[PDB]
Design a protein around this ligand. Structure first.
Ligand SMILES: [Cl-]
Lengths: 251, 253, 249, 250
């Protein structure tokens, strides 16, 4: 009776119960999805296993997206358990700490740029490509972005470049996978309460709804985009940010 | 446990079972909402009363948005039935025939421009303002737009200017009403009769959209039901494309 | 050798030496344009005649854009002086005061909305239409907008709607007039004399400074010239880069 | 009396008299700038010295942007001739053939992605940063982009992602360099005369019903490089006969 009843959805980047990924997993399970999860390094096997149990699942698989072999092995393993995949949630995203603090050029190096683009941008369509052989015709792929892709935000720096490439990959993936029937979207999420205070307070004071978004609100938006309720929606970057993107705040 | 359970929603622009408003009404009713409807002219009262009955409702009210007396009376009447309003769907718009055909300048006149903007853009925030005193604190207001607001589309002409002004009102309304808790959004819907040039747009979108298909009132209805609900509580000031991804490509090359 | 040499350009909206239109007039005259000017109300005839003389021109014409008769008489009048028009600068824009102060809904009325859209948006394509029979095939039409068209700015309110319609008219005009060869563009100018809005822009713009009417004027002159023959349907921000950031954090 | 009189400007990506960089070079020279040029590989030193000579210049320097040492050496060299630099034109951009033809996923590989972003996106702010110690306070940096950054265009594929990253770099650079006074912009240029189809479509559906020329892109570039554009930064200016602004072909 839930709006994702019978959908099988693989989620990446579940590291804690304050994750956007956790919020989405919770919303998805409530609406009747069956879930599977990735984790990075055998050191995190136990932790991810406990999360999966919370969501009524035993399906966890290692996947460091830096490694082509691991990406390919993920879907070979997953296919031994599921005949098809209906949803993928891409919620990973890394830049070296210097590359997203202080001045943009101070933190810029060829390697910092490379890693940021490889993990935060390349990995989405790499996963989509590796999943394609087992995707259902009406599957939905979801990634996460930030307003820093669209306008210059202090400190976001190299990550802003990488998220811009990510949101472009959303549009190109939509075209590539869409004749089959597969949809591809992103949520551009506002910051979540858990110098970053400057941002949280500013957003709370300047957003149209005068409040920060919660992982529950982002989770519900993601569940919607993963479902057949959203079958008319693809190639979209949906803002879930209390309307902050639509104003000139503070002015 | 429909996701709009207990919500009270007023819908404008329901003229047929092919209407975008009809699709939104069906989805809202499926998810547990109670519905009320508007109509223009006593000559449509019997027909909207029939449609309302189809959605288990007896609540219909005249509202020609060209007339301040009708806009100012609507929510006074509604209030006698419902103490508060949780949703409003604005799905109305008009421009004179010549203002949406051929060359943009040939069809341009002051009165054509005035009408198009009065009915298609001004009416949305006008209804919001009249509704304000009875809106629930978590109410949600939804309007409908088109890609012609964003980029120039053949024939759309003066309606493109009025949809741009409508999309701007979504952002300004979101700010005005947001502290209270009210959300304001638009759906930019793809094309959904026998109009030859419109048939060409439908064919182009089917061949060139990412999903290779035109959208349906069911798909637009569900998106609308979502934006109307607490599942969309983090979403305001948004223009959401429900158009098979068409706005995101350069088609035809 | 000026990049607008020979170009005949009509400018609306010149009310003082602080007007955006005055900066564009300066930049255009510097690059060799011949200039003509409009004014609203017989009361302002002498003061516009004086600005015109500063720019070496005697061509001044009444034009209240609310009045169809004035719009059509403007072009009948100008045609007796100039066989063809190479440029038009639309720098007019008005909303009743309550419609651009305070809360959006408090100032919303059907008549406030109608006036704001009629003067600030409809007048641009209306002037284009009246001008068309005398426009040179490579003419250039320029209007002025503001970031308030794109994102909700405090107090901008009904003018944010009007400027969104105006920017849309730039794209539809460009399509309508483009096969003949006429280009159509907008500059989205930063704020220009409130001290707090200006201070926020000075502190948060990438260039850490407010734009000047000399900077907007030069960008205008460029778009008016054949140097910009590849540019149409564009909304160019001339605002010290303020549109491109999230300030205040 | 040109509008770039006295400005010293460095141009990358000049490979032929049909290069966008050649058009921008012509316009800048016309407007009074002094030019310097980069080239890739010993193999091309002669052809660039010639082009340079066409524009009254003997300042040519090797610079493969895949290489940190070469980027740092360019400005070390340049400084021995120019005490300060007023403009930079970044007009380079590569993706492997497979990564910019056919289906997006067929051409996607990790290395294709890496190369496209490294040469077409990263290189711009990389040159900015290495130039910074000799940049004049009113300098202007310009890069070249394409509509495929904003919307999905057939075959553009991995390059669309790299151009999106480049355009974002324009906004971050503008903030980083703006307090000093340096401006940073992009021109999103239309295609210049599979590709035949693209040019035909633009000529049929653009508002001006014509493709843009390197002379039109050049004049826009010279403007953005000049003090005439001193109010303009963080901007992606379309020079594409209005094509970006329409839904063509319906
Ligand atoms: Cl007044």
């Amino acid at each position: 009776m839930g709006f994702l009843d019978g959908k099988r959805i693989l989620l990446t980047g579940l590291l804690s119960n304050r994750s956007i990924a956790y919020g989405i997993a919770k919303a998805c399970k409530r609406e009747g999805a069956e879930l599977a999860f990735t984790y990075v390094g055998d050191r995190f096997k136990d932790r991810i296993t406990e999360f999966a149990a919370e969501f009524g699942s035993e399906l966890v698989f290692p996947c460091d997206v830096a490694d082509d072999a691991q990406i390919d092995a993920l879907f070979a393993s997953l296919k031994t358990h599921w005949d098809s995949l209906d949803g993928l949630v891409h919620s990973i995203g890394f830049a070296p700490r210097e590359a997203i603090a202080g001045d943009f050029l101070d933190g810029l190096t060829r390697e910092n740029f490379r890693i940021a683009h490889d993990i935060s941008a390349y990995s989405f369509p790499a996963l989509a490509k590796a999943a394609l052989p087992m995707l259902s015709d009406d599957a939905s792929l979801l990634t996460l972005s930030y307003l820093g892709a669209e306008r210059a935000i202090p400190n976001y720096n190299t990550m802003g470049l990488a998220k811009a490439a990510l949101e472009a990959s959303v549009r190109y993936l939509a075209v590539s996978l869409g004749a089959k029937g597969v949809r591809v979207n992103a949520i551009s999420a506002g910051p979540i309460k858990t110098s970053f205070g400057k941002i949280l307070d500013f957003v709370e004071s300047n957003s149209p709804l005068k409040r920060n978004v919660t992982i529950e609100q982002v989770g519900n938006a993601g569940a919607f985009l993963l479902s057949d309720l959203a079958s008319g929606v693809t190639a979209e970057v949906m803002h879930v940010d209390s309307g902050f993107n639509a104003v000139v705040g503070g002015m």
